[PDB]
From a paper:
[name] is a dual specific tyrosine phosphatase (DUSP) that has a conserved tyrosine phosphatase domain, and relevant phosphatase activities with p-nitrophenyl phosphate (pNPP) and phosphotyrosine peptides have been reported. [name] ([name]) from [name] PA14 has been reported to be secreted to the periplasm and to link the extracellular quorum-sensing signals to EPS (extracellular polysaccharide) production and biofilm formation via negative regulation of c-di-GMP (3',5'-cyclic diguanylic acid), which regulates biological processes including motility and biofilm formation in bacteria. [name] adopts a canonical eukaryotic-like DUSP fold with additional secondary structure elements that distinguish it from other DUSPs, including an N-terminal β-strand β0 that caps and extends the β-sheet, and a C-terminal helix α6 that packs on the outside of the protein. The active site architecture of the DUSP catalytic domain is defined by four loops: the protein tyrosine phosphatase (PTP) loop containing the conserved catalytic cysteine Cys132; the general acid loop containing a conserved aspartic acid that functions as a catalytic acid/base; a variable insert that varies among DUSPs and is predicted to involve in substrate recognition; and the α4-α5 loop that is equivalent to the Q-loop in protein tyrosine phosphatases (PTPs).
In an attempt to provide a structural basis for the phosphatase mechanism, we co-crystallised a [name] mutant of [name] with pTyr on the basis that a [name] mutant of [name] was previously reported to be inactive by Koveal and colleagues. The [name] [name] mutant co-crystallized with pTyr shares the same crystal form as native [name] with two molecules in the a.s.u. Comparison between the wild-type and [name]-pTyr structures reveal an r.m.s.d. of 0.35 Å for 162 aligned Cα atoms, indicating no major differences between the two structures. Close inspection of the electron density maps for the [name]-pTyr structure revealed phosphate alone was present in the active site. In one of the two monomers, however, clear electron density was visible for tyrosine in the shallow binding pocket approximately 5 Å from the bound phosphate, indicating that pTyr had been dephosphorylated. The tyrosine is trapped close to the active site, and its position overlaps with that of a glycerol molecule in the wild-type structure. The trapped tyrosine stacks adjacent to His76 and is coordinated by a 3.1 Å hydrogen bond between the carbonyl oxygen and the amide group of Ala104, and a 2.5 Å hydrogen bond between the amide group and the side chain of Asp175. The side chain of Asp105, the proposed general acid/base, is approximately 3.8 Å from the amide group of the trapped tyrosine, and a weak electrostatic interaction (3.6 Å) is provided between the carbonyl oxygen and the Nε atom of Arg138.
Author numbering: 34 to 195
The structure:
């Protein structure tokens, strides 16, 4: 992230980056991350894996939105459902979305947010996904594969409908 438009680093230990005052991406957080998440005033923690975040969250007054998935199985239908739930969660306050390593599944949905919601073109979002410090491209084969060949116009159109 040297382009100021890319996600800014907050906590590289858990791969935590800021996309906006109301949206954060990261890897799997722990008990030590709770304090920081409350500074950022996170109200919703979206997870793309099965690990019950309520375990490390403790009695933190945040909503848990579990959306467990597999990057090699995601399609346009799942993406739209996630983007809608992310947007709705943003209206309630700042949101953290995460996975195991926060560069494949997270990198996929992050890039799609850039394209569908913020109106970035496909390659711009890709350049932030593969380069930006989230990981190396070997970790993102599934994510990279989907972003390419994804009908961005059909996604934006279907998004504008609902």
């Amino acid at each position: 992230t040297r382009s100021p438009a890319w996600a800014q680093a907050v906590d590289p230990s858990i791969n935590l980056y800021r996309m906006s005052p109301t949206l954060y991406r990261s890897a799997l957080p722990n008990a030590q991350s709770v304090a920081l998440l409350q500074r950022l005033q996170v109200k919703t923690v979206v997870s793309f894996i099965k690990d019950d975040d309520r375990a490390w969250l403790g009695q933190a007054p945040v909503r848990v939105l579990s959306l467990p998935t597999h990057a090699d199985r995601v399609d346009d239908a799942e993406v739209l459902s996630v983007l809608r739930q992310l947007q709705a969660a943003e209206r309630e306050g700042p949101v953290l979305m995460h996975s195991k390593h926060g560069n494949n599944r997270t990198g996929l949905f992050a890039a799609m947010y850039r394209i569908v919601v913020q109106g970035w073109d496909k390659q711009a979002a890709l350049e932030e996904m593969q380069h930006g410090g989230f990981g190396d491209e070997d970790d993102m084969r599934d994510a990279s594969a989907y972003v390419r060949g994804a009908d961005v116009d059909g996604l934006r159109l279907a998004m504008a409908n609902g």
